[PDB]
């Protein structure tokens, strides 16, 4: 690439993997969102919580793809595996899965940051810092808060309804 | 002091002690507020209730320091001891501690007022009356109301959630 | 903590110490501010300069406490020692003490950043960079400028008056 | 008086004396104000400072006369003695005289308050508290601040000019 | 050049030299400006005075380059020598250097105008008259005024502070 400078092939490849992770996460949240839109689940607040996350994750992927091109790396797309579940159980089950999911994204972010440090790629580090690292931390704190409130509320049916009505 | 008039050394010293009490109270509410901001406590309404109180108590201290200077007394600051607890338990536990705290502030206000009467310091008395005495009484009534409602709600997890959602 | 990830116990403890440092600094500026509000000192511009700093330092502490919770660390509060002085002398004396104070805060920030690097905690590093490091540098430059102007003006009484009137 | 209730003849008489004191003070400030308006004194800021005080003192007298009538006391006016000086010297001289003056007013206020306590006249006490006591304290603090700044500035001619230009 | 008409090679070359002079002047003012922004100099008004001049001189150069092209002359750029000093001393020192600098620019303008007369180039003369000659005269008068006021003020530290505060 005529523009490529200080951009290691290792980071380039890891960015492509992270794109796949973010699109996988988006797909997972799409599935979560529509599960809670089921007539036999019917928790609209939960559906909107996860649909908004699907969108955030997709935008994460796009931001990465844009940066990939800005550095002169080459996007390589791979198959996107389907979410790990077809049905997601209670709001509690779903929020637990989501936080596991976010932690895995966060760890991939940290790994990519470590890679960038090792490759002495300060632009990559700045990029991760500005658009991802604090985002993840805040999201995970939020999910932690929700988990705690969901769990305080478990009259399990009553609790699930109230959480969706009054928090989500 | 060129401006000092009818301001006893006893009141001056007691005002300095009260400043320390108010800053101690502010510190206590800071600790309360951030405890409820913990991901494993997660009661945002409670966190905001106590953070607002931290701010009120700090402003109380400042009002006292300003009056101290207006009378030609000399501010003397002392170490501020840390709050009595590191973790504050339930909203009920926390509100009980807060009302104990406010009662102690109120008693210090009353003591200072008695001192002012004994020292025949009508400016001090007016000052306490305008900016503190009714404030405390109203705050303590509010905390009393909350305690009663919190207690009515003890499904303890459910009650704590509902109180935070619908009152705080 | 359910949310805690890549947050070392060393950083957690150092963040708690830094909170104590920032609250100590806030307390010091409170004392500075009210000293200059004394009828026998009477430099309103200086009083407002330091009172605004007290507020900035308190907000620094709060930002740290919020981040502590966001990472799943646990706030631990300690006694706050009283400021190093009861009276602060001239504006020059006071500004010299303030810059010593800011340098000590800045050094604690740098130490904490070094700790974060050693612990490979990129979120911590981003956090310090966004909300503290440049803030300190700018504040210290400002105090440096003031010190130089104060010193140019030492007709010491005249100089102190003019600085407060025309700069502060 | 058909309306008179709990209003002692002692307080009534003391209110009349205080009216005379306030009108005397107003007259003194009138003299101060116009002295600084002299072509050979020419300190417009000082002239306006004292003219505004003349007006405040006159309004104090009126407030007292209104209260006198509200309680069913009878205003009795006496000769108003001329101010203690015909020329007031420097701004420093003038501000020193003013603070002596305000202290004497404040002491008369305190005496009247003590009288009211002894006579168990809570309306009188409330009246003094709302409209005079804090007013005096604030004014005296202000004059204290000015005295300190004036004195810091004593290049006596230069200092007097700068104070008037930059503070008054 | 297809457009070149009545534009002597002598004027063309002299315009290129004048561009170098104006860029040199801009560089000198950049250095002046940032010197006064030093924490140990700290005269913000002086810094802004010289930074604005740096910008004016750069725009002078650009205006000349534009005219060069409008006449069908060819811009030829040369090395720009660094300013004559690294540190500029007092405001007085700096303003003296600036006026020497402006006089040298003005003389180069006059020389170029004389050249234009000799070459019977009325467009060049009009150009210098409209955009430079009166500009220089006004700037030099301004610097003359400042020099006189700076010098009246030499309590050298006090004077330098007051000039920056009240004139610049
Ligand atoms: C502007 C609103 C966007 C809302 C997006 C919400 C959820 C996204 C759901 C699934 C995305 C996962 C895989 C789809 C593959 C590519 C998406 C195209 C990018 C886009 O479509 O941009
Ligand atoms: C919103 C205005 C804030 C102005 C603050 C200015 C000065 C703060 C002075 C002292 C603070 C130092 C110790 C007090 C302990 C806790 C403060 C409560 C937090 C808050 O009170 O938030
Ligand atoms: C509405 C503007 C009032 C400005 C007053 C400023 C200075 C007052 C000066 C002298 C007053 C002292 C004795 C005069 C006696 C009675 C004043 C009439 C009440 C009034 O005149 O009300
Ligand atoms: C629009 C704001 C302009 C502010 C300019 C202020 C100072 C200029 C400082 C140094 C210029 C001297 C040499 C630089 C060489 C070419 C400048 C590019 C022209 C431009 O940069 O135009």
């Amino acid at each position: 690439s005529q523009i490529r400078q200080n951009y290691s092939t290792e980071v380039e490849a890891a960015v492509n993997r992270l794109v796949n992770l973010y699109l996988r996460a988006s797909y997972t949240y799409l599935s979560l969102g529509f599960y809670f839109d089921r007539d036999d689940v019917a928790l609209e607040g939960v559906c909107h919580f996860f649909r908004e996350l699907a969108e955030e994750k997709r935008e994460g992927a796009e931001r990465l793809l844009k940066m990939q091109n800005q550095r002169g790396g080459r996007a390589l797309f791979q198959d996107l595996q389907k979410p790990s579940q077809d049905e997601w159980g209670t709001t509690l089950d779903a929020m637990k899965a989501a936080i596991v999911l976010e932690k895995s994204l966060n760890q991939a972010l940290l790994d990519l940051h470590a890679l960038g440090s090792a490759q002495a790629d300060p632009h990559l580090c700045d990029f991760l810092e500005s658009h991802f690292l604090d985002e993840e931390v805040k999201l995970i704190k939020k999910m932690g808060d929700h988990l705690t409130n969901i769990q305080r509320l478990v009259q399990a049916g009553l609790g699930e309804y109230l959480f969706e009505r009054l928090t989500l």
Side-chain angles (χ1 to χ4, degrees), chain A residues 23-24 26-27 30 51 54-56 58-59 62 80:
Chain A
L23 292 180
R24 275 173 60 193
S26 185
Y27 203 13
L30 182 67
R51 285 189 75 180
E55 166 175 351
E56 299 306 296
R58 168 192 72 61
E59 289 164 357
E62 292 186 3
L80 295 176

Side-chain angles (χ1 to χ4, degrees), chain A residues 34-118:
Chain A
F34 279 97
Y35 167 81
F36 285 96
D37 173 64
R38 285 172 46 162
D39 79 87
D40 60 351
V41 177
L43 292 166
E44 191 176 359
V46 184
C47 169
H48 201 80
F49 179 82
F50 287 128
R51 285 189 75 180
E52 178 57 66
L53 287 178
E55 166 175 351
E56 299 306 296
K57 294 313 173 190
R58 168 192 72 61
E59 289 164 357
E62 292 186 3
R63 186 163 296 239
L64 288 155
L65 285 167
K66 167 180 169 177
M67 177 277 285
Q68 183 77 290
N69 275 347
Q70 283 192 330
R71 297 299 304 278
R74 291 302 168 238
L76 286 175
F77 295 103
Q78 306 289 352
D79 297 333
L80 295 176
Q81 62 191 283
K82 73 184 189 184
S84 65
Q85 298 178 40
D86 294 323
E87 302 186 332
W88 301 93
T90 54
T91 300
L92 180 57
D93 287 327
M95 197 69 67
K96 297 209 236 205
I99 201 170
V100 165
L101 181 50
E102 294 306 321
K103 281 165 169 292
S104 77
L105 291 188
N106 198 32
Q107 192 55 58
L109 287 177
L110 300 179
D111 294 349
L112 178 59
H113 177 271
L115 178 54
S117 290

Side-chain angles (χ1 to χ4, degrees), chain A residues 80-164:
Chain A
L80 295 176
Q81 62 191 283
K82 73 184 189 184
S84 65
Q85 298 178 40
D86 294 323
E87 302 186 332
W88 301 93
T90 54
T91 300
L92 180 57
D93 287 327
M95 197 69 67
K96 297 209 236 205
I99 201 170
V100 165
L101 181 50
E102 294 306 321
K103 281 165 169 292
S104 77
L105 291 188
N106 198 32
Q107 192 55 58
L109 287 177
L110 300 179
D111 294 349
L112 178 59
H113 177 271
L115 178 54
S117 290
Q119 294 291 332
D121 192 336
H123 180 275
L124 177 72
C125 169
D126 173 65
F127 170 79
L128 298 176
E129 295 182 340
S130 304
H131 309 328
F132 293 92
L133 297 182
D134 194 28
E135 170 179 83
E136 272 318 300
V137 157
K138 294 202 305 285
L139 182 51
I140 298 173
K141 174 61 167 64
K142 188 177 195 210
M143 292 180 170
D145 294 352
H146 285 341
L147 277 180
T148 292
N149 278 281
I150 291 169
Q151 300 185 297
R152 233 194 320 260
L153 284 160
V154 296
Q155 325 287 65
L158 177 60
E160 193 165 13
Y161 177 74
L162 285 168
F163 183 78
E164 182 267 336

